[PDB]
C-alpha cells in the first residue's frame, strides 16, 4: 500500500524502472479495514479503461510516471460490466452508459438505454435515494449535461436515456411522462430527487416548461427556484455558496450542454501517424476562465457535504473521456483523464484526512483507443504524440467506420481506498459495487 | 479471497449478477502472507490482456461465468510493460515478447528483440540461473518453439531473438556466435543452462550442427544426448518419465515449430460480423492425441520438479493466444486461453495443497482483439461467435492493415496466490515482478 509508484530511478539500469520500494504485505494488511464507512466518494471516468489510463499517463507523466490520484489507490481489481438484451434477457456483451450506471447504482442488470429500471421496466431504488433516506447528505457532479446517463441514473427511473425533458419524454417514454401519470422526464425527476449538491452542465433542457403538475407552464429552471434550489452558473457564484441541504439545495448549471474539454488537439486520421507530424496538446482557448474544473466542483461539493454529521455519498464523473474517445480525438480524451486525476487527488486528500471515507475510481465500460507501434499502418484513425518522455506515442481507433468510435467489452480496473475497499480486489461485477456501497454505509 | 466468482443466480434479477458472496476483508487479510515461498510457478499468457480474458470467458464460460483457474487468484493489480528505444534509451510504449520476458526474468528494461541483455548489450542473469545456483530445481514449459523469446529469455543472452541456432547467430548475432568466442546461439545456450525440466516445441533447430567447441560437428540433438539429456517427443514417452535432475535433465520436443492449437475456426474478415454467419469453434483436427496439452506438460513438470525439497521455479506459457491474436483468429485464440486455464488449475491445486507456493498469472503485453457490439461496422477484421449464453459476441481486430495484428501498450492484469502475492497488488512494473520472485524465494 504505497503512495509513490513512479519508476524509482534510471529506467535503463537494473531495477531502475521499479515502482515498488519494498514489500507491500504489511502496508497492505494495514489498509484492510472492514469497519463502517461514514462517507463514500465514487469517481467514474466515463469510458476510462486500462488503455485510457496508460495512454494519458504516458503522455502526461511519462511511461515511468504515476498519476498522483488515479494510480494511488492501494487495493485494485478487474470488474465485468455486460448488459442484458431486453427481449431475451441474455447478456449483451457491450454495455452503454445508462445500463452500466444502473447496475452500480441499483444492483440489477438491465438493457442498454434504461435508467433506474430492470428489463421488465420495473424501477428500483438507487444508492443516492437510499443514502438520502438513511439521513446522509448527497452529491452528484459531472462535466456532462445533467440529463446524461451517468449522473441521471442516480435520480431517475426512465425506460430510455433520451427522455431528458417534457417534450422528449412524451414521445419516447410516454408511460413516464408526468401527464400520462408518470414520474416525469429525467430533468423533472432530478428536480424531485433533491440531492443536496448537484453540479454539471445541461442548462438547455431547463428551458423546457412543464406540461402538467404544479409548475406546468413554467420552465424547469423556474421550478427549481420555486422549490428552494440555489442556482449557480459560474466559478465565482459556486464559490460563494456557504451551504447546501434539503432546505437550500445546490444546483449548478455551468453549460448549456456538456462542459468544455480541457485540451485541444486535432482528430485522428487515416495514416495520421505516418502522414502527419507528432502533435502536442494545448489548452482549450474557448474554455472561459469562469467555468469550474472537475477538481473545483469536487472540492466545493466535499466541503458543503462534509458539513453533515450522518455522512455523505458523492458521485463525481469525468464525462468527456468517453465522448472524446468517440470523437477519435486523443488530446481531448487525455486532457479529460488528467482533469479527473485532479478530482481524485482532492477526493483522496480528504479521505486520508477524514479516515472513514471510502473512495473508488473506475469506469462504466471500456472504449476504443489503443496504444500501438509508432510505425503502425492501421485501417482506422491514428495520431502520433509527443509524450513527456520526449518520445512518440501513437494512438489508434479502429472499431468503427461511423463518425463515432465504439465502446468495448473488456473487463477493467476498479481501485479503492478506505474502509470496505477489499471488496474491490479480484474479479467482481459492476453490480457488486452497489452492494459494496450499501454495506459500507450500512444502508442495509 | 473467493474460489467462486461466477454470478450468484438470475442475472436479470437484483443481486443475481453478483460474484461476491460476502465481504472479502477477512478472507483477503488471511491471504496476505510475507513468509518465504519455497516454490514459484509463473504462468504467462502471451498477449493475454484483460480484453483477451473477457472474450474467452464470455465464449467458454458465459458472461457471468468464471475461469476456475485464471480468475481464481485472490490478489490482483495492473502492471506496465513498456520497452526501451535502444538508441535514445527513451521509452518505447509497445513491447515485443523478448524485451518484456527479459524484464521479468532479469529486472532490467531492454530494447525490443533483446534476450537477456540491457540496451548496452551487457548480459544480466535471469531468475532461472539464480534459482539453479541456489540449488532449486528449475522448469520451463511452453507451447511455442523453445527458442521463442518467452522461454528463451530465461536461459539465453542474445542481442536478437532471431539467433535461434548456429547458422542464424553467425550472421545475426556474430558477437554471440560460438566461433567468435560468444556464449552461443539460443539453442546452444538452452542446452548449457541445463534446467531440470524443459518442455515445448521447436525441434527443427536441434538438427543444426555446432560450428565450434566440444560438440562441433554434432547436431544439437546429439549434443543434448551426449550431455545426459533425456529426450521425449510425445504424450506417451513423457508420461513414462519418473525423474529429472542435473544428472538426467528432461527435454521435450513435441513439435517442429510451435505446438498445434486446440480449436479451429475461420479467420476474422472485413465486415465478417454482418456478411458472414456466427461461428461456433470446433476441435483442430490437426492436433494429434500424441501431442500433450499445456495442462499435461504443466502437471508432469510439477510432479518431477516437486521432488526437490529445497524448492523449484517453473515458468509455463500458453504461447499461441498471442500468435492466433496476430492471425485474427478468435477461435484459436480462445482455445489457447481455455488451455492456459487448465494449466492454472493444475498450478493452483498443487499450491493450495503445498501451502508455500507463489502462483502468478499474467501476460507479457496487451494485444489487438477487442469485444464490440454485434451490429458494429468496423474498418478492420471482425467475426461473430455463439457463446455459452446462447448469445452472439463480436470480436474486432483493427490496428493493422498488414497480415499481422499488432501488440498494444495498455497496462494489463497481474494476479497472484501464495507467499509474497501482495506485491502484485496496485500499480507496479514488469521489472518489479523479477524482484518479487527473487525476494519470495529468498534467492537474494
Ligand atoms: Mg457519462
Ligand atoms: Mg512467446
Ligand atoms: Zn460510458
Ligand atoms: Zn460512450
Ligand atoms: Zn508476447
Ligand atoms: Zn506477438
UniProtKB/Swiss-Prot annotation, chains A, B:
Residue sites binding Zn(2+) 1 per the record: 322, 326, 407
Binding sites annotated in the UniProt record for Mg(2+): 46, 148, 150, 317
Cofactor(s), by name: Mg(2+); Zn(2+)
UniProt EC number: 3.1.3.1
Keywords: Disulfide bond, Hydrolase, Magnesium, Metal-binding, Periplasm, Phosphoprotein, Signal, Zinc
PANTHER family: ALKALINE PHOSPHATASE
Entry's family note: Belongs to the alkaline phosphatase family.
Name by which UniProt lists this protein: Alkaline phosphatase
Native source organism of the sequence: Escherichia coli (strain K12)
Amino acid at each position: 500500500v504505497l503512495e509513490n509508484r513512479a519508476a524509482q530511478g534510471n529506467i535503463t539500469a537494473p531495477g531502475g524502472a521499479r515502482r515498488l520500494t519494498g514489500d507491500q504485505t504489511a502496508a497492505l494488511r494495514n489498509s484492510l479495514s472492514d469497519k463502517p464507512a461514514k462517507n463514500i466518494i465514487l469517481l467514474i471516468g466515463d469510458g476510462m479503461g486500462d488503455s485510457e489510463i496508460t495512454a494519458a499517463r504516458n503522455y502526461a507523466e511519462g511511461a515511468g510516471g504515476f498519476f498522483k490520484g488515479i494510480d494511488a489507490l492501494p487495493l485494485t481489481g478487474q470488474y465485468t460490466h455486460y448488459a442484458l438484451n431486453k427481449k431475451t434477457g441474455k447478456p449483451d456483451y457491450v454495455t452503454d452508459s445508462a445500463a452500466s450506471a444502473t447496475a452500480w447504482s441499483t444492483g440489477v442488470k438491465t438493457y442498454n438505454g434504461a435508467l433506474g429500471v430492470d428489463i421488465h421496466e420495473k424501477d428500483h431504488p438507487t444508492i443516492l435515494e437510499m443514502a438520502k433516506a438513511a439521513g446522509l447528505a448527497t452529491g452528484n457532479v459531472s462535466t456532462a449535461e445533467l440529463q446524461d446517463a451517468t449522473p441521471a441514473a442516480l435520480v431517475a427511473h426512465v425506460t430510455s436515456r433520451k427522455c431528458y425533458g417534457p417534450s422528449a419524454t412524451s414521445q419516447k417514454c410516454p408511460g413516464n411522462a408526468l401527464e400520462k401519470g408518470g414520474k416525469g422526464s429525467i430533468t423533472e425527476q432530478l428536480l424531485n430527487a433533491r440531492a443536496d449538491v448537484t453540479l454539471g452542465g445541461g442548462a438547455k433542457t431547463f428551458a423546457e416548461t412543464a406540461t402538467a403538475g404544479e409548475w406546468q407552464g413554467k420552465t424547469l429552471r423556474e421550478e427549481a427556484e420555486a422549490r428552494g434550489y440555489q442556482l449557480v452558473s459560474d466559478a465565482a457564484s459556486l464559490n460563494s455558496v456557504t451551504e447546501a441541504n434539503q432546505q437550500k439545495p445546490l444546483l449548478g448549471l455551468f453549460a448549456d450542454g456538456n462542459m468544455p474539454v480541457r485540451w485541444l488537439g486535432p482528430k485522428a486520421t487515416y495514416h495520421g501517424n505516418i502522414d502527419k507530424p507528432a502533435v502536442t496538446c494545448t489548452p482549450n482557448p474557448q474554455r472561459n476562465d469562469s467555468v469550474p474544473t472537475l477538481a473545483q466542483m469536487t472540492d466545493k461539493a466535499i466541503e458543503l457535504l462534509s458539513k453533515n454529521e450522518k455522512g455523505f455519498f458523492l458521485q463525481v464523473e469525468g464525462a468527456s473521456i468517453d465522448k472524446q474517445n468517440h470523437a477519435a480525438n486523443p488530446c481531448g480524451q487525455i486532457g479529460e483523464t488528467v482533469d479527473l486525476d485532479e478530482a481524485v487527488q482532492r477526493a483522496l486528500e480528504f479521505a486520508k484526512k477524514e479516515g472513514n471515507t471510502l473512495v473508488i475510481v473506475t469506469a462504466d465500460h471500456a472504449h476504443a483507443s489503443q496504444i500501438v507501434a509508432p510505425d503502425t499502418k492501421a485501417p482506422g484513425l491514428t495520431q502520433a504524440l509527443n509524450t513527456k518522455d520526449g518520445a512518440v506515442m501513437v494512438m489508434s481507433y479502429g472499431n468503427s467506420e461511423e463518425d463515432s468510435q465504439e465502446h468495448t467489452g473488456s473487463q477493467l480496473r476498479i481501485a479503492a481506498y478506505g474502509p470496505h475497499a477489499a471488496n474491490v480486489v479480484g474479479l467482481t461485477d459492476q453490480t457488486d459495487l452497489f452492494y459494496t456501497m450499501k454495506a459500507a454505509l450500512g444502508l442495509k
